[PDB]
């Protein structure tokens, strides 16, 4: 009854935030190509 809803709420905005790190730490060349194709 404890680890079925308290272990969830710690982890739902975590993976919502963790993917935002890799889209800036690794996905940042997907912006400099997008901004200036010239």
């Amino acid at each position: 009854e404890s680890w079925v809803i308290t272990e969830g709420r710690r982890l739902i905005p975590e993976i919502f935030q963790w993917s935002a790190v890799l889209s800036v730490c690794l996905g940042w060349p997907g912006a400099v190509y997008f901004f200036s194709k010239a």
Partner: protein, 59 residues
């Protein structure tokens, strides 16, 4: 062939010897994203969730 400006992948395969490399560069990097997917996750669950843990499990 010709390199492309702002490219990130192989040049176009015109040889089965070259075509074998592209199915081995992707066979390797499929097993490199599980390891990078683990380390990038197992380092965010520690810096975020365990920097607010004042009682260190030192045993």
């Amino acid at each position: 062939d010709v390199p492309t400006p702002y490219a990130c992948y192989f040049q176009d395969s015109a040889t089965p010897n070259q075509e074998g490399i592209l199915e081995l560069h992707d066979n390797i990097m499929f097993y490199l994203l599980v390891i990078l997917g683990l380390v990038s996750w197992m380092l965010y669950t520690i810096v975020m969730t365990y920097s607010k843990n004042p009682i260190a499990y030192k045993y």
